[PDB]
Nucleic acid binder design. Structure first.
Ligand SMILES: Nc1nc2c(ncn2[C@@H]2O[C@H](COP(=O)(O)OP(=O)(O)OP(=O)(O)O)[C@@H](O)[C@H]2O)c(=O)[nH]1
Ligand SMILES: [Mg+2]
Ligand SMILES: [Mg+2]
Ligand SMILES: [Mg+2]
Ligand SMILES: [Mg+2]
Ligand SMILES: [Mg+2]
Ligand SMILES: [Mg+2]
Ligand SMILES: [Mg+2]
Ligand SMILES: [Mg+2]
Ligand SMILES: [Mg+2]
Ligand SMILES: [Mg+2]
Ligand SMILES: [Mg+2]
Ligand SMILES: [Mg+2]
Ligand SMILES: [Mg+2]
Ligand SMILES: [Mg+2]
Ligand SMILES: [Mg+2]
Ligand SMILES: [Mg+2]
Ligand SMILES: [Mg+2]
Ligand SMILES: [Mg+2]
Lengths: 26, 117, 41, 97, 45, 189, 176, 191, 139
RNA sequence: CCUCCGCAUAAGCCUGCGUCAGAUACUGACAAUUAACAGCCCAAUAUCUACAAUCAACCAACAAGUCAUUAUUACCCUCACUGUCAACCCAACACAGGCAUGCUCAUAAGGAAAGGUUAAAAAAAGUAAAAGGAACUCGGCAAAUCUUACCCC
RNA sequence: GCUACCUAAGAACAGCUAAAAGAGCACACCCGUCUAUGUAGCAAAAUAGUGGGAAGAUUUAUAGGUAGAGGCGACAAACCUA
RNA sequence: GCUAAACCUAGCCCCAAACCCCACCUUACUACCAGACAACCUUAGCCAAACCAUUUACAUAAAGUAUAGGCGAUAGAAAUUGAUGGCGCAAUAGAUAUAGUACCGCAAGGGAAAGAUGAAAAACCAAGCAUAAUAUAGCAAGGACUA
């Protein structure tokens, strides 16, 4: 595990974007 | 080539295998012609008692009172064995009371211990 | 490992996004995608 | 893939614990206390670098000089080798000469 | 032709790398001491 | 093993009410609870039954575990997993009434309910496979409730099906029943 | 007879065999030396029977009936041995003042480690015993460096243990 | 046990325990606050009250105590449900299985007030050590064969046949059994 | 006795006597066909055949005619998860032939659940005619 | 159909195709190799010990050779311990290699060159070949035959 | 524990010709001339054939010795754990 | 959607303080016989001097001073003065270490790898491929284009 929070937060945002694109909301 | 396995009599040439034992205590000696002379006194003699009429079974009834452990000590043994006679003869040469100056001359010398178990 | 890079994913993506429409491994492998993308730019 | 898929556990820092709250106190012990104590005397740490600073070679030399006799055998051998290497590097290598 | 330089024989093994031989000379004593310091499970052969 | 499994129910019904004297059992129930009413039980039993089946409808296993016993929950849920059941009680033809009661100590009460209900069971894919969503059907049944005698309660334990019970509603899809899968040496008989 | 190696024929095959409690050291301390001597062989016969049962159960791939009684017997025999040893030690201390039954001495081995060399029984004096004279009980100067190295290795291990303990304690305090 | 062995509901030597914790597992150790032996106040059989989670408020009886993880198992309380005997064909039978509770999540109950209480290990001149409830006083009590053919009778077990004497077992038995030995043990050299 | 220093015997000395024997033996079922008068034991490794003879004749009053012993090597081939060999202990095996024509044959040793059984009996396996429809509902 | 082998001892290894159950010559459990064979020896002090072996008889030698006690004093009163398994060892391997000895001199013992098909090239091993017979080639290399004479070192 | 040499005490050498032979042919055994194959091979030097020796300065099992500024060497700057 | 991906604590680093039953030298881990045999003795070399040969380091201040030195590379005093944790690592990191184990070597010796559920188990992302082989022409893209 690499210590840090900001890279993880950015990757979480990217994962959220990809999730939305794959399953766009109504 | 094996170093981590225990060295036993099963490993090595004939001489090694014959020479090494398995811990069994010796019983005699070897004479000319490899004849083994077995000494009776070197054979442990199991002093098995007479169990007839013995009332102590291997287990103890669970309905038995529990008592605190009081490991026997030299002081306790002296008090329970020698102190009464000492008191009596003081009111009225420790060999008479029981002390033995030297273990030599005894069959069972306490130190150096010369008996099994 | 006092200080370690944690953004390497996004650093790679900044290049691969421009290589997604290439052919072969040039669109997947950064070591190749970066060269092809520099040539493309 | 060298990126974690979950947010790390939140890191809560108490800015007002005793250490942070009283940090820096008695740094002016000298000027505000008739110079009975120098501020460097407030430094707790290795005996050989209390109130002292230097590059790696100087630090190694000081460590060997001050606690060399109390060092473990292999640690002292490592320190001697490190001093040798640092001497060679600083006195024989570098861009400037 | 080569490779089979190890012709095992317990007599040679123990007489060459045994505990008794290692303790015979100070150098072998230091070998055993080095093994003990390193923590080897097999000090001698 | 010093600790042992603490069961909250029993394997099965004590004495089956063979459908078309128990005051001792009622006495035991009352001596254990002190506020029970046989005459008032049927309404509570009907409410428990309706609530349990609505919980089946909504897949509320938490409430099912409170409304039915551990010998009941698997029977109700095992085959309904991965399918949607649209159950609805429409009315009770005749009032429900206690029938038989028997009794670390559990007490079982059999309640005969002749009510009217609806069913519609769909596949994983939402394809109807049993009953009609709207058509009501008359159902006569014997629900055996059970209770454990400190924090126990009355929960459906079983449903006794009379041997003379009318055949259940036919299934929508046709079925094939394979014959003996004979090995080469074997011959058909 | 060999039948004493097996449980009672009625007990054969029983899933469970009820057994009493293992003899306690305090209970045994009240018994005479002859009584303890007889009880030792009673327990020995029981122990042989139980070991036979264990081995036969392993052979038959079945659980041993009431395995706890073997542990009870072992505990009883250990208690009896401890009581006899206590009596012997007290008598030895009274009559000779020696706290060890076997002669020995603190000696420095060839590796510089202090060991408790336990004396062996010989028929000839030590100055004549050839093998004993081959055995070395002194460390030469070259062993001092290795003694220091071993000391420092032990110190490092101890320091690591203590520092880790303190770290864990601080983590626990922060968590609670 | 292996270092950092993870104590679980199954006993540390059962088949299930060996299945769950084979010798090679290296799971993260569970952080448990270090309650001293003299501060532990929950015992098997004690009536307790559950403070958190499902079945909060309900009072049950402690059935097991996994001291190594600050655990008390309340019988028939804090239960989920699991299938036992589930085979390839049979679905098995549903069973209520308790989940362990932390002593911080569980509080003892007054013997008569029937309410949760805080406890202190106050010494009493007669009951040297015993639990005392704080908010309302009162002491909470600590809750809780036929000889076989191979079991000594109580009287035989307690008989004091030991007459202390300055004799070893060996010589005492020699006298008792009549063994006569005249040979003198020749002195040997020890070294 | 085992794990004890034997008092050294010099010529003309007293007999070596052991009072509380430390040897514990096992009577084991032979793995191969044996003569009717033969008994197989597993013995502590330090016990001689003379020791076994005296042990049996004194503690058990078993008339022993002959005794033979062999050291069975326990397998060291098995390895744990760390690839370290697990050593099966070596053990001594003694074959004892009884005297006076006596015969020995190893004895034939070894000659909630209710709820589970009830539920299994009450399985009521699914009917193929039902076609997977749950059976609980009475409709 | 093959048989180089094979069976034992030594050395080496150390349970490494015995039974049961699981897997998928492996894992776990259980069992086993029993001394007569072999190893493990010898009370001192002196004192003896020129004449090989080779069928040891002639002969024949040179390289000149493995084999012996007595005197006195001590001393019997008592069959332990250890190896014994295997398809095996050294070569990283179920390695065409290495591996001492006794018998078997082809075996009574031990084994299987072909997974199935087709019958292309090229390649490997072998067999046969018209007429010629070294014209090949650096050289008769290889193969086939059994074959002279002369030179250097 | 390979290899060079040595020390102790062992072992092997069929058959035929000749005759007391560092003799001839030729097994076992030792070696490795020439060819083919192999060249990450069966093999970190092998296989098949062919070939030299095979009662001797022979071969070989066992244990021991000589150790790197060295050893050993019928000198090939050989061999001393690929 | 497969290989897989991640993960937090096992421990470790630097400081402070503080000084730290039996068997086994014979073939070690071997119950039990006349010994005699006993340890101490300058480090060297690499390297620098651009070779190499004398030579080349092993609290503060005085002071890099006096001195030494193929007086050159460099070496270098003394008098005298007074003298409580972590802007550490977090499983390719930190000890080599889960271990000096496995494994390798005759021996000295060399020397690894790795684990991650939950309160309780008595409950979407690398490469590589697949979905889905391929169409004239060419550093595989760019300008483009309806394409
Ligand atoms: N710098 C430093 N301080 C330490 C270390 N170990 C302990 N301490 C300090 O020692 C003090 C006392 O430690 P505690 O464990 O609380 O008490 P203790 O056991 O009496 O302490 P010790 O006597 O030092 O063993 C605290 O200030 C700690 O931070 C260490 O390794 N380094
Ligand atoms: Mg050789
Ligand atoms: Mg034997
Ligand atoms: Mg074949
Ligand atoms: Mg083929
Ligand atoms: Mg032709
Ligand atoms: Mg020509
Ligand atoms: Mg011609
Ligand atoms: Mg031509
Ligand atoms: Mg030719
Ligand atoms: Mg011949
Ligand atoms: Mg010749
Ligand atoms: Mg030359
Ligand atoms: Mg030359
Ligand atoms: Mg230079
Ligand atoms: Mg330079
Ligand atoms: Mg000075
Ligand atoms: Mg690491
Ligand atoms: Mg991918």
């Amino acid at each position: 595990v690499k210590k840090g929070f900001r890279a993880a937060f950015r990757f979480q945002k990217e994962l959220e974007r990809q999730r939305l694109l794959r399953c766009p909301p109504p | 080539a094996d170093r981590m396995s225990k060295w036993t009599s099963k490993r090595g040439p004939r001489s090694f295998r014959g020479r090494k034992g398995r811990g069994a205590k010796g019983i005699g000696f070897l004479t000319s012609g490899w004849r083994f002379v077995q000494i009776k006194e070197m054979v442990p003699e199991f002093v098995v008692p007479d169990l007839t009429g013995f009332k102590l079974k291997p287990y103890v009834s669970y309905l038995a009172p529990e008592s605190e452990e009081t490991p026997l000590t030299a002081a306790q043994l002296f008090s329970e064995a020698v102190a009464p006679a000492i008191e009596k003869d003081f009111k009225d040469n420790l060999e008479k009371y029981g002390f033995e100056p030297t273990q030599e001359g005894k069959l069972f010398q306490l130190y150096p211990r010369n008996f099994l178990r | 490992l006092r200080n370690r890079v944690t953004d390497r994913y996004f650093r790679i993506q900044e290049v691969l996004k421009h290589a997604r429409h290439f052919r072969g491994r040039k669109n997947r492998c950064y070591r190749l995608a970066v060269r092809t993308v520099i040539r493309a730019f | 893939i060298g990126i974690r898929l979950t947010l790390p556990p939140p890191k809560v820092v108490d800015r007002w614990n005793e250490k942070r709250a009283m940090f820096g106190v008695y740094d002016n012990i000298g000027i505000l206390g008739n110079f009975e104590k120098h501020p460097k005397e407030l430094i707790r740490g290795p005996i050989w670098l209390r109130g002292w600073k230097g590059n790696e070679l100087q630090r190694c030399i000081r460590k060997r000089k001050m606690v060399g006799s109390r060092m473990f055998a292999d640690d002292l051998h490592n320190l001697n080798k490190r001093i040798r290497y640092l001497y060679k590097h600083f006195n024989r290598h570098g861009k400037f000469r | 032709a080569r490779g089979n330089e190890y012709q095992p024989s317990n007599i040679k093994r123990k007489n060459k790398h045994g505990w008794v031989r290692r303790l015979s000379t100070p150098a072998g004593v230091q070998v055993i001491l080095r093994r003990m310091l390193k923590g080897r499970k097999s000090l001698s052969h | 093993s010093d600790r042992s499994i603490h069961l909250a129910c029993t394997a099965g019904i004590f004495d089956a009410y063979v459908p078309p004297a128990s005051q001792v059992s009622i006495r035991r129930i009352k001596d254990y609870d002190a506020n029970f009413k046989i005459k008032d039980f049927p309404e509570k039993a009907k409410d428990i039954f309706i609530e349990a089946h609505l919980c089946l409808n909504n897949s509320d296993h938490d409430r099912l575990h409170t409304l039915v016993t551990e010998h009941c929950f698997p029977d109700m849920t095992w085959d309904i997993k991965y399918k949607t059941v649209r159950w609805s009680f429409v009315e009770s033809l005749e009032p429900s009434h206690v029938v038989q009661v028997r009794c670390n100590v559990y007490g079982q009460i059999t309640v005969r309910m002749h009510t009217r209900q609806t069913l519609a069971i769909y596949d994983r894919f939402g394809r109807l496979m049993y009953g009609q969503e709207d058509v009501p059907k008359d159902v006569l049944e014997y629900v055996v409730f059970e209770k454990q005698l400190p924090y126990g309660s009355w929960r459906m334990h079983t449903k006794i099906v009379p041997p003379w019970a009318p055949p259940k509603q036919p299934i929508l899809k046709t079925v094939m029943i394979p014959g003996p899968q004979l090995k080469p040496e074997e011959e058909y008989e | 007879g060999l039948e004493e190696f097996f449980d009672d024929p009625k007990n054969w095959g029983q899933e469970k065999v009820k057994s009493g409690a293992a003899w306690t050291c305090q209970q045994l301390r009240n018994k005479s030396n002859e009584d303890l001597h007889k009880l030792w062989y009673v327990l020995l016969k029981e122990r042989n029977m139980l070991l036979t049962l264990e081995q036969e159960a392993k052979r038959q791939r079945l659980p041993m009936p009431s395995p706890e009684r073997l542990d009870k017997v072992v505990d009883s025999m250990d208690a009896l041995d401890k009581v006899v040893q206590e009596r012997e030690d007290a008598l030895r201390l009274l009559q000779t003042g020696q706290e060890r039954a076997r002669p020995g001495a603190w000696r420095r081995d060839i590796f510089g480690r202090i060991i408790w060399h336990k004396f062996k029984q010989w028929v000839i004096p030590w100055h004549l015993n050839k093998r004993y004279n081959r055995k070395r009980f002194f460390a030469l100067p070259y062993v001092d460096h290795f003694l220091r190295l071993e000391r420092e290795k032990r110190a490092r291990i101890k320091a690591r243990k203590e520092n880790l303990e303190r770290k864990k304690a601080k983590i626990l305090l922060k968590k609670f | 046990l292996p270092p950092h062995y993870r104590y679980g509901m199954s006993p540390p030597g059962s088949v299930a325990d060996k299945r769950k914790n084979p010798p090679w597992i290296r799971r993260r150790p569970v952080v448990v606050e270090p309650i001293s032996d003299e501060d532990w106040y929950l015992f098997c059989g004690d009536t307790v009250e559950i403070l958190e989670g499902k079945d909060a408020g309900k009072q049950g009886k402690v059935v097991q105590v996994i001291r190594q993880r600050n655990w008390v198992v309340v019988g028939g309380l804090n239960t989920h449900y699991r299938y036992i005997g589930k085979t390839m064909d049979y679905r098995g039978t549903m069973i209520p299985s308790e989940a362990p509770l932390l002593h911080r999540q569980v509080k003892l109950v007054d013997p008569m007030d029937r309410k949760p209480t805080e406890i202190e290990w106050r010494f009493t001149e007669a009951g040297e050590r015993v639990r005392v409830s704080t908010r309302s006083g009162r002491i909470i009590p600590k809750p809780e064969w036929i000889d076989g053919p191979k079991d000594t009778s109580v009287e035989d077990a307690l008989e004091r046949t030991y007459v202390p004497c300055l004799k070893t077992l060996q010589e005492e038995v020699m006298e008792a059994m009549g063994i006569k030995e005249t040979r003198k043990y020749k002195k040997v050299y020890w070294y | 006795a085992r794990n004890v220093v034997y008092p050294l015997y010099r010529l003309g000395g007293p007999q070596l006597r052991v009072f509380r024997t430390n040897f514990f033996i096992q009577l084991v079922r032979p793995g191969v066909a044996q003569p009717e008068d033969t008994v197989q034991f597993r013995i502590p490794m330090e016990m001689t055949r003379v020791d076994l003879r005296n042990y049996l004749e004194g503690i058990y009053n078993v008339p022993v005619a002959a005794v033979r012993t062999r050291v069975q090597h326990g397998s060291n081939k098995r390895r744990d998860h760390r690839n370290v060999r697990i050593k099966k202990p070596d053990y001594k095996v003694a074959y004892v032939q009884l005297a006076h024509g006596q015969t020995f044959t190893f004895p034939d040793l070894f000659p909630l659940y209710s709820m589970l059984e009830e539920e299994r009996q009450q399985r009521q396996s699914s009917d193929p005619r039902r076609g997977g429809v749950p059976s609980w509902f009475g409709l």
